[PDB]
Each structure stands twice: as C-alpha cells, then as structure tokens.
Amino acid sequence: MNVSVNIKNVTKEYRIYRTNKERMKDALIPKHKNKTFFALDDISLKAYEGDVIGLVGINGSGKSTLSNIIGGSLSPTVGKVDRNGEVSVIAISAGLSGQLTGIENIEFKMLCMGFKRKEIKAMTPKIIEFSELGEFIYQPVKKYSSGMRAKLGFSINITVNPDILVIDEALSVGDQTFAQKCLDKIYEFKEQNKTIFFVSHNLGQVRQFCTKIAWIEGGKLKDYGELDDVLPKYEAFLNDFKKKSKAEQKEFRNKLDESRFVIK
Amino acid sequence: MNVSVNIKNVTKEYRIYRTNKERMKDALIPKHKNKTFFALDDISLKAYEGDVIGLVGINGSGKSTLSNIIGGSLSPTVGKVDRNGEVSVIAISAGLSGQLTGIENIEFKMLCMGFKRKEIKAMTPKIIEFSELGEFIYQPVKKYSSGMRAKLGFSINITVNPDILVIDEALSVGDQTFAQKCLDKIYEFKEQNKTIFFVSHNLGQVRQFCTKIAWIEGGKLKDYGELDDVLPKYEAFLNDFKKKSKAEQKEFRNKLDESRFVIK
Amino acid sequence: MSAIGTVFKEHVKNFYLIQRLAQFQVKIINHSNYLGVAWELINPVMQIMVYWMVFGLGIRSNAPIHGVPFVYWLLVGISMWFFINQGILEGTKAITQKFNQVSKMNFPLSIIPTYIVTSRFYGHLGLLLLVIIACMFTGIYPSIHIIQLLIYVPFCFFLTASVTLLTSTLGVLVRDTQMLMQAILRILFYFSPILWLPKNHGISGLIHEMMKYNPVYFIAESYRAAILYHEWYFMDHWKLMLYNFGIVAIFFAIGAYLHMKYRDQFADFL
Amino acid sequence: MSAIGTVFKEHVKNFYLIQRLAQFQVKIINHSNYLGVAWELINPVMQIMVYWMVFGLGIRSNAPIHGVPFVYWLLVGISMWFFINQGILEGTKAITQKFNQVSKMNFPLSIIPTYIVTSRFYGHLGLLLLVIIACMFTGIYPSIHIIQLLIYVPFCFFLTASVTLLTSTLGVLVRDTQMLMQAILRILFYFSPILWLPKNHGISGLIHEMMKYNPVYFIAESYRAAILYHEWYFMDHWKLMLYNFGIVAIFFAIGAYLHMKYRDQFADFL
Ligand SMILES: CCCCCCCCCCC(CCCCCCCCCC)(CO[C@@H]1O[C@H](CO)[C@@H](O[C@H]2O[C@H](CO)[C@@H](O)[C@H](O)[C@H]2O)[C@H](O)[C@H]1O)CO[C@@H]1O[C@H](CO)[C@@H](O[C@H]2O[C@H](CO)[C@@H](O)[C@H](O)[C@H]2O)[C@H](O)[C@H]1O
Ligand SMILES: CCCCCCCCCCC(CCCCCCCCCC)(CO[C@@H]1O[C@H](CO)[C@@H](O[C@H]2O[C@H](CO)[C@@H](O)[C@H](O)[C@H]2O)[C@H](O)[C@H]1O)CO[C@@H]1O[C@H](CO)[C@@H](O[C@H]2O[C@H](CO)[C@@H](O)[C@H](O)[C@H]2O)[C@H](O)[C@H]1O
Ligand SMILES: CCCCCCCCCCC(CCCCCCCCCC)(CO[C@@H]1O[C@H](CO)[C@@H](O[C@H]2O[C@H](CO)[C@@H](O)[C@H](O)[C@H]2O)[C@H](O)[C@H]1O)CO[C@@H]1O[C@H](CO)[C@@H](O[C@H]2O[C@H](CO)[C@@H](O)[C@H](O)[C@H]2O)[C@H](O)[C@H]1O
Ligand SMILES: Nc1ncnc2c1ncn2[C@@H]1O[C@H](COP(=O)(O)OP(=O)(O)OP(O)(O)=S)[C@@H](O)[C@H]1O
Ligand SMILES: Nc1ncnc2c1ncn2[C@@H]1O[C@H](COP(=O)(O)OP(=O)(O)OP(O)(O)=S)[C@@H](O)[C@H]1O
Ligand SMILES: [Mg+2]
Ligand SMILES: [Mg+2]
Fold it and tell me: C55: which of B11, B189, C195, D69 fits an S-S bond (Cβ 3.0–4.6 Å)?
C-alpha cells in the first residue's frame, strides 16, 4: 500500500552524431538542431513494497535504461524517480579483477559496495563456502573458468540487503548443481517483502518469479499490470511476430524506429 | 569414416603459486618441486567428419581447455592434436571495439579472422541485413545494448566457412525473434557435414543438436560415445548430485580436486 | 560552499577505504611482475640514475651545490616528482576507467582520484625514506629541522590530490584535457629547481623569478631545507608558502564545484 | 633461419592488413576527443614548444647551430623521437593486450607490434611533412639531397619495428621488461644530438664519442643532412650507417627467433 519506487514522466534522450564536425557544432552553438534518439519516452509507473516486476520487451526497447535510471547509475533527461529505500543491483562482474585473487576480490568488491571492515571480515567465510571454489580461492581470477568467475561474483553480489533490488538477465548462475542455491537465495529475497525489478528474456523464470509485468516497446511503456494480464499479451505479440514475412518485420522495425528519432 | 580431429594423450598442467617467492624459485631453480594442477589429464578421443560432439560437465571440468586446445589457441603440455582441415571458433566479442562503429567493427573483426578486402566488401551488406541494427550500424558499439552487441558479433562470426567448428555456450543470441535465425544458421552449418564441437550446459540444445557426447569430469574424459548412450548417464549423475547432503557434495568435490593437484 | 563540505566529508569518513583501495591498486598494476611491488621503488631509482648521468655529469660535471654534492641534492629534489607526475597522469583518467565498476554501487565518487594518487604516494614515502637513509651515509644527519616534513609531504599529497580532483572531472567532460597533461607536466618538470639552479648558469631576473610560480619549486626547496640545508624554510619563504596554499585552495574549490555539478551525468560523458 | 623467413613472409603478405589495422588503432585511441585524430599532430607540437622553450632559450638563448636557427634544427631532429618513443612504449605491451582478441582466429601474430608501430608512423609522416613546410618559410628549400629521406625514414620505421618485435615477446615472457623501457628510452633521448651538441659546451672525447653508438644519433643527423644542411650523409658516415644496419639486423634476428619459440605458449605467459 506504500509506494517504494515512483517513476514520473521519465524521458532519456541521446544526441546522435556521425562525424566529429556535427558533435563540435552541437557543443559550440547554443541553438543547434540535431538528431535525437529517445531511449525512453515519458515512462510513468509506481512500485509498491513487495512488488516483483518483470521488465520484458525486444532488444533495444529501453529496459536496461529504465533499470539503470531506477538503480541511480543513469540520470533522466526529463522526469523524476522517487525511491523510498536503498537500491542494490545484482551485476556479478562489476568489481571483479583478474589480477586479484578470489579472496582479494571479495574484499575489494565488498569495499566498493560500501561494506565496513568488520562486516567484510564477518561474512567472508560463508561467501567462500557458497562459492564452492575450493583451492582456487587463493588463485587469481584470470585463471578461473567462466562458471567459477560467475559463481564468485554471484556469491559476493548476493550478500546485499537493500530495500529495492534490481536483477539483470540472471536469476541463477553456474551449472545445474549450482543454480538451485541461487534460486533459493533470490526467493529468500522475495520472501522478506522487497521491491524487485527483474530484467530478462527468459519468460519461464519471469512467470515463475514475478508478480507484475512492465512491457517496454520502442522506449515506451506498452502495458503495466499483473503477470496473468500482461504476460500472455506479450507472448501473443511474440508468436505473432514470427508468423509475419521479412518485409512485415522490417516494416514493424522501421515504424518503431521512426518515432524514436527526431531532429530537435 | 575419415578422421577430422585426432586427440592423443593430451595433458594440460599449470604450476600453482601463492607468493612471488615461489614463482621466482620455480623460474630460477632447474629441479624445483611445486604444486601442479591438471586442467586436462590424458585425453584421447578422435572425431570423424560430420560428427557433432557435445562437451558436457560441471564447472571447472576442463571443457574450455579442451576446446581451446582443439581450436589451436592453447598448446598441450603433453600429447598431440591432429586436425584435418581449418578450425573456426564462434566467439562473438573477440574483435568488437566499443570505440569503433558497427560498420568499422565488421571490417576490423573480418580482417582479424583473415578475410580479404574483396570478400569483406562483398559480404558486408548481408551482415548488416542479418544484424537488423538499422540506424545504429553507423553508431559506436559502446552505445549499443547488450543484445545489439551480441547480434552484431554473431552476424560477423557466423560468416566463417571452416572444416572444424567450435561453438562455446551459445547456439543462439538475442531475443526470441532473433534466436530462430541463429538456429537456422547453425543447423545449416550442421547440414554441410562439418565436425562441430559444442560446449554448453543447456542440455536441451545439446540433445536437439549434437550426435555424440564427450563427458569431462575432473580433467578426465569420463565417457565418450553416442548421445543416447552417454547423455542419460550425465543426466543421471546430475539428478544424483542434488539428492546428496552438503557434506557428501563437499566430499565429492574434495575427492575430485585431490587427484588434480600434485607436487612435482 | 556545499560542494566543499560534501567532498571534504566524503574524504574524511572514507580514509580507510582510500588506503585499502590504493593498496589494491598497487597490487593490481604490479601483478605480473616477478619483482612484484618493488618496481614502484626500482623504476624511479633507475630514472634517478639516468637524470644524474645526464644533468649532473654532462651539464655541470657533478659539481657540488650549496656545499652539498649533486647526487644527494638531486636525490632530495626529484623524490616527489615521480609521485606528482604519475598521480596527475593516472588520476586525470581515473573516473574515465573506474566509474563503470562503481556506478551501480552507492560509492563516494570524489575519492577515486584520491586513492589513485595514494597508490603513488606509497612509493613516494618509500623513496623518501631511502633518500634520508642514503643522505645519512655521507654525514648529513637528521636535525630538528626534519619535522617540517610533517607539513611538506602532506602538502605535496594535497596539491596532487586537488589538481587531480579538478583534472579527473575535466577529463570526463573533455577527453582532449588528458592529452594536454603531457605538455603541462613537462612544463612543470623542466621549469623547476629539481635538475638545475639558474643562478650559476644564466639569467636570474626572468628564468629564476618565474620559477617561483611553480608549486614544484616550493616542494623541492622545502624538502632540501628540511633534509639537506637544516634550516626553517618558512622564515624566509612564508609568502611563497601562502601563495602555494592559495593555489591548493583554488584548485580544490574549482575541482569540488565541477565534480558536484556533473557527477550525476558522468555516464552521459563516458 | 626459418624464423627470419617466417616473420618476413608474414610481414610481406599482410601489408594492407598492417596498414588498415594501424588506421583502426589510430581511430580507437582518439575516439572520444573533440579534435579527433589531430591530437597525434597537436601533442608533439606542444611538446616541441616546451623543449624549445627549455633547451633553446634557457640553455643556449636560441643561438644558431651550423648556420641554421635553433628552432628548425631542433624541429628536424625531434621529428622522429615521438614516434620512436611511442612505438617502443606501446608495442612492447602490444601482444600483452592484443593476443586474446586474435588468439582464436588464424592470425599472423608477428605483425601486431608492427601495426602498433605504424599507428605512430602515420603521425610521424604528418609531422615530417609539416617540418619540411615550416623549413620552407625561412629559406631552406628542398634540394636534390632530400631523396635520402626515402632511405632514412624507412630505416627509422624498421629500427622501431625490430626493437618492438624483440621487446613485445620479452614483455609477454617477463612483464618486468616493460618497466625497464622507461629508463631505456630516457637514456636514448638525452644521450643524443636532438636537444644539444656537446661540441660547443663540454667534453667531446667521451660524451660525443659515446653518442655515436645511439641509433638516434644517426637518425637525427641523417634527417638534418637531408633536410637542413643539403649534403649526402653517407659519404662521411658510411661506417655509422653500416653499424646501424647491423644493429637493426641483430635486433630483427633475435626478435624473430624468440617470437617463433614462444608464440604457441603465449596463452601460458599471459
Ligand atoms: C578541445 C576541445 C574543444 C571543444 C570542447 C567543447 C566541450 C563543451 C561541452 C560542454 C559541457 C562541458 C563542461 C565544460 C567544462 C567545464 C567548465 C569549467 C572549466 C574550468 C576549468 C558543459 O555543459 C554544461 O551542461 C550543464 C547541463 O546541466 C549546463 O547546466 C545548465 O545548462 C543550461 C543553462 O546554461 C540549463 O538549461 C540546464 O538546465 C542547466 O543545468 C551547463 O551550463 C553546461 O555548461 C558538457 O555539455 C553537456 O553535455 C551533456 C552530455 O552530453 C548534455 O546533456 C545531454 O542531455 C541528454 C542526455 O541526458 C541528451 O540530449 C544529450 O546527450 C545531451 O544534451 C548537455 O546538454 C551539454 O551541455
Ligand atoms: C626481473 C625478473 C627476473 C626473473 C625472470 C625469470 C624468468 C625466466 C622464465 C623462463 C622462460 C622465459 C624466457 C627467457 C627470456 C628469453 C631469453 C633470451 C632473452 C635475450 C634478449 C624461458 O623458458 C623456456 O621454456 C622453454 C619451454 O619450451 C624451454 O625450451 C626447452 O626447455 C627444456 C630444455 O631446456 C626442454 O625440456 C623443453 O622441451 C624445451 O622446449 C626453454 O629452454 C626455456 O628457456 C619461460 O619459462 C617457461 O614458462 C612456461 C610457461 O609458464 C613453462 O611451461 C609451462 O608448462 C606447463 C604449461 O604448459 C606448466 O607446467 C607450467 O605453466 C609451465 O611449466 C616452462 O616450463 C618455463 O620454462
Ligand atoms: C647527455 C649529457 C650531455 C649534456 C649536453 C651538453 C649541454 C650542456 C649545456 C651547458 C650549459 C648549460 C647550463 C644549464 C642551464 C640550466 C637552466 C635551464 C632552465 C630552463 C628551464 C652549462 O654551462 C654553465 O653555464 C656557464 C657557461 O660557461 C658557466 O657559468 C660561469 O660563467 C662565468 C663567466 O661568464 C664564470 O666566471 C663562472 O664560473 C660561472 O658563472 C657554468 O659554470 C657552466 O657550467 C651552458 O653553457 C654553455 O656551455 C659551455 C660551458 O662552459 C660554454 O662553452 C665554453 O665556455 C667557455 C667559453 O665561454 C670555455 O671555457 C668552455 O671550455 C667551453 O665549454 C658555452 O659557451 C655555454 O653557452
Ligand atoms: N549512450 C547511448 N547513446 C545512444 N544510444 C544509447 C546509449 N545507451 C543506450 N542506447 C540505446 O538505447 C536503446 C535501449 O537501450 P537498452 O536499455 O540497453 O536496451 P534493452 O531494452 O535493454 O535491450 P536489450 O538489453 O538488448 S534486452 C538501444 O537502442 C541502445 O542502442
Ligand atoms: N591459466 C590457468 N592457470 C591455472 N588454472 C587454470 C588456468 N586456466 C584455467 N584453469 C583452470 O582449469 C580448470 C578448467 O578450466 P575450464 O576449461 O575453463 O573450465 P570449464 O570446464 O570450461 O568449466 P566452465 O567454463 O565453468 S563450464 C579450472 O579449474 C580453471 O580454474
Ligand atoms: Mg567455460
Ligand atoms: Mg540489456
């Protein structure tokens, strides 16, 4: 009943250049007209506490732009985001250095997330136990496999305790023997009534995890509502798209991209 | 009936150090004894023409090491790989530069794969048409979304014509509307009777794509044979692993890692 | 005025964070070396040997300066240079290559060039300790005048940090700014008292008078007076110290305002 | 002997590939600049102004050398330096940051430091053209002696490429080697005829005689004789040219052997 995230009329615009001469004229002339791309265009949705919201849409729709705007990394060109509570983003690799050993990466990434010295010293061993790396935790991260690096990054990233959580493209990580622990940890995050924003193309995890769907189409919020109301319509759009010809799909893509570009 | 890839007794060993003092003693002393890790241990399998071989196993098994040894990037410590034919690896991002525009990346990546000037000028437009990037093909790659970068990298990477193909972790790329074209292109690669090595954890794509399974467990070839013979046993191992306790799983991991480490 | 208090408070509750991230950066840039983090000591010493072979033997034939042999005179003067040059060079681009790894975390963004500077300040402190120990081997022993280093070494750190705080924000807004620093640092190097004194060579009314506006002139002269000459440097050069403090305050003020104005938009310029 | 033929053949069937990858590298390192790829021209010119302010006005008060004013004398001498320094610095680490992007492709691995060197050779050619045009504005016009540049500029490119081919392989095997290059290049810079001539200043029997073993001395002197002095440089300095050709051949031979021995194992050292 209490609003945790309030997005009001958020627009993200990017100036589009082909040469350095165009970039320099836009910088130096106060009323220069240039091509502008709308990554987002007047997004208005409000999130309550305990809402698990899935961000669906085709490639280049603007869901990572909206997720970065919610997470605070990116500023809106226009509009405001009001967040009641702390925001954490689960991105496994942002603090991981190949040069540092796995034990060193846990402290460096944890320091960069804002944990204190006593907290890092307290919860390093269960991060080591969760990662299941064994003897390679004293080895440099550039010597890891991709699944080992993903497991270590997820084990560091899962220890946050925010009010608003943002997850991008991965509920789970690793092989089949490791994914269930990740699902249990994410479901434990869901169990303590936190606002979770999920950005993925895996519609099975979206259906089994989320409670609300925000459909983004061409920089705009196409639909927002309950999962059983909005997700069948996105699935119907997805099956309707494959039954068109190549000319019809190109016409749809061109009509989508026509409104997103403007000279101003 | 003709052997395309012949792997005979391939072993990959890595020296393991904790301090710089140990690394310096190993470098400077002719008979220094040190901890050695077996990434691979006496691998012997031979591939015929038209074989589609799936490399399965848990994280850190050594399947990327075997795939890089087959692809020529990594040298065996012991043993020999004999390849009849050219080898190409589908890794989408290896030549992609954020600073370069998508049109510039296609030429730079294609030059680095070894294509000639007339070939690059000939097949640039169908790469642009396959990528479906639209107006963003003249924009820098650092301004792309992750799906757009993946689509461009796949569109450049799919144009090779080898005798032996190595695919790592991705048959498809992009959203649901783009994955079917990737599946059609990979199946077209399968249709011209090429030896394909597939490394993935997605067992559905492995079952629907591969004809032979190479199971790697702890740096060793656990089983090699037909898909219907070997893949149910790997699936049985996978379901047997989740029904153990945490102590039993730790004991299995420790027993696996005990044989892989040796002082020599 | 709120920008000054904001940057100051983000620097004072994150002192341990700055030190630990600087130690991690030192370990990161020296990871594949066989000698490890000793190269932060070895490479300035080799450059010192090159500069003494050129500017000591080739120019003045290793003649003493002010009753001190030239090797120790140059050794005290060049000790802070490598830190200043490396900190200004690396921390101008610090937000350019370090913003994206801390963008999604709640991080104090103004301390990134400060820990990049502190990663070179560690090697500066080690080199200064070796320089004092090497000066002990001739007959120049630490007197009571060496406690001025407790003022002068933090001043060198704060000058480098303020210049770096301004130039990191300017580098994100205009990348061309990082290209300017190569010529700017050579201007700061050669127009200084570190390799020569233009009193026994040429014109003092123009070359030596304009060298006073360089902060490097004060830092090299102050270390030499603290370590070699055994004099209180602030009795005769208090106006120069006040000018240098004003330069540091102006750099900190302009850098703190620019960072607070563009910090939300950094993803846009990157 | 097979290593020489292998590296030579990989360089001669990939000439267009080297040129196009060098152009792409030039566009990559100058992408976020407002001025674009003009900084490869602008930054050496600013450094030239700094070096003329210091070593021309401060040292010799802009006195002419050999009937030529000092600005054009320094301008012809320092033209190849920035290319040599930048190519040796960047291409020592070229396989360290460029092997992984071409490891899974069938690529000629010996041309990676060569295109890294050629990316600086483009700016060297532009700077040399501007230097000749600037020398036209005084009264020094191109005579028949300027066709020696067709020998001397490729010699500078081949020296940089051979040294870079050796030092790139050594940098992958020992990372410490890249740390050595900072002192080595300052030795090559200051012990040369680019900023000064030790004939009217100090000792010629030791300083000037040992400067002949530097390849930089031949390259600066040869460009000056081709451009400024209007003389055939190989009539009086053929032994120095033979010594420099032997140095280039020795560097190419040792670099080509080491690269062929470790190229399969590069993933191990990286
Ligand atoms: C050798 C090379 C030579 C060429 C160099 C030319 C470069 C000049 C660049 C100018 C620059 C650098 C600061 C200058 C240096 C610091 C000065 C002190 C230095 C002393 C040592 C200053 O731009 C500043 O931008 C501020 C914006 O808040 C603005 O504030 C006030 O402005 C108005 C009232 O004037 C008032 O309306 C506003 O509300 C105020 O807030 C400042 O007045 C303005 O100076 C940055 O330009 C900025 O770039 C931004 C992102 O690309 C861009 O925003 C984006 O918006 C969309 C995305 O979100 C999207 O559409 C575009 O991506 C882009 O539009 C800004 O529009 C642009 O301006
Ligand atoms: C300031 C810092 C000071 C400290 C610096 C100390 C650094 C010294 C390092 C020594 C070094 C650099 C070359 C030296 C520079 C070039 C010289 C010329 C320079 C002139 C300008 C030369 O090592 C060379 O290795 C060759 C290996 O083929 C070897 O060849 C012959 O050797 C035998 C007959 O002698 C004969 O048995 C062999 O068959 C021959 O082929 C050469 O004789 C040997 O010199 C490299 O060390 C190598 O590193 C390799 C990968 O880490 C390592 O292989 C790995 O194998 C497994 C993985 O696959 C795994 O187990 C390990 O990962 C590692 O074991 C090698 O074992 C090691 O040796
Ligand atoms: C890779 C290493 C190689 C190095 C390359 C070689 C280059 C070296 C340059 C040398 C230099 C640079 C000064 C440094 C400036 C620093 C500030 C710059 C700052 C700008 C940011 C140092 O020369 C110095 O300057 C004075 C010049 O003599 C001299 O001063 C004295 O003057 C008082 C009388 O006037 C005297 O009574 C008193 O004792 C001092 O006060 C100093 O003692 C002398 O050391 C310039 O001096 C040049 O060199 C010679 C010096 O001898 C000189 O030649 C000749 O001099 C005598 C006939 O005239 C003859 O007897 C010499 O035999 C012969 O040599 C040149 O004509 C001169 O132009
Ligand atoms: N800095 C930028 N400048 C210009 N366009 C940008 C920039 N960053 C992103 N875009 C464009 O913004 C659009 C949407 O961005 P994203 O949010 O990353 O896409 P997306 O909806 O997440 O789609 P995905 O990641 O492939 S599922 C795309 O067309 C991008 O090319
Ligand atoms: N340079 C290296 N030095 C030491 N160990 C290494 C090195 N490269 C890889 N390894 C180890 O070799 C083992 C197997 O490597 P990989 O082939 O990448 O693993 P993997 O079988 O592909 O498992 P994945 O990628 O998580 S499904 C792992 O334990 C790695 O840590
Ligand atoms: Mg892998
Ligand atoms: Mg995305």
Answer: C195
